[PDB]
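Thread: ACV complex, take 2
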Amino acid sequence: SVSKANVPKIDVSPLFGDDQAAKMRVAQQIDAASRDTGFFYAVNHGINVQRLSQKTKEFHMSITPEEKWDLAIRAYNKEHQDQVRAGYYLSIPGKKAVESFCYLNPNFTPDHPRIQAKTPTHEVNVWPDETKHPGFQDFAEQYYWDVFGLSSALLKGYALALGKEENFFARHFKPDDTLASVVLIRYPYLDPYPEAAIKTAADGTKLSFEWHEDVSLITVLYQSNVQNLQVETAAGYQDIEADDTGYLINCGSYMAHLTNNYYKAPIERVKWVNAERQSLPFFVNLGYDSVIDPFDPREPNGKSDREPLSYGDYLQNGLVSLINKNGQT
Ligand SMILES: CC(C)[C@@H](NC(=O)[C@H](CS)NC(=O)CCC[C@H](N)C(=O)O)C(=O)O
Ligand SMILES: [Fe+3]
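Output below.
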């Protein structure tokens, strides 16, 4: 029936250090994984993922219907026209099981020039009442910077893996302008589970979210210990093993663009599982004006004829296209 994807566990801790040869050995493993199924687990990453899943659980289970409307993105609340990305994504009982909360760069404030200029994809985060969710905002903002630091190191590994200097990507990944987002996703246990919330794939598999390529440079994902993800290969979809201690890493379609598809953006989908679980992606996005010059590591001269793509326009297009294809989450 369904085979299992080879998803190696890569000790990424050398990427935080100054042992350059050890960094290269990590880079080789990243290269191999990126050329195989496109996924690896980053282990020995230094993030307290036990507290992450705890603080997230407390929030999802304690937020009330009134608070969800008050935080809701524009897709669920016409009063909130500035909330395209950040805020609460409501479930629809009987129809849509998943619900989630998305937040962006905490440095996006009314003082920020991109907020002042009303540049697309930049928004000021919305937060629940502190007294109703003590410590939640503090946890969430600190987590953003914790995973930012992990992601910076991973980007050093990807750069070395492609034959570049280690800051080739990370130099565009900055706290003052990153469009990176965290999404705290709840997938509920439901009895009965509404069939309307289950999609059926071409191959018959029941899904919660259909196939797609990630809109990101890379995706840095923590999930609770419930197997659900699949990656498409030429021989069909393969199950990605769960690992609630590691971070599941893959390239997004911006990486595929700039490498001339040498590191493809894998096609992934989410199987339907009737189980309470958490999915907490960090989408590594660059700045709105960031441009990486494409190259082709397959060619002796490394030359690509692909257009340099401004990251902001890429992100705007990608997020709207994904909603159109796979629905409003
Ligand atoms: C597969 C997981 C990463 C997760 N899927 C997801 O997060 C899916 C597919 S990558 N991503 C999205 O819908 C895009 C969210 C973008 C976010 N609101 C933003 O403004 O930056 C899931 O569990 O459904
Ligand atoms: Fe995805």
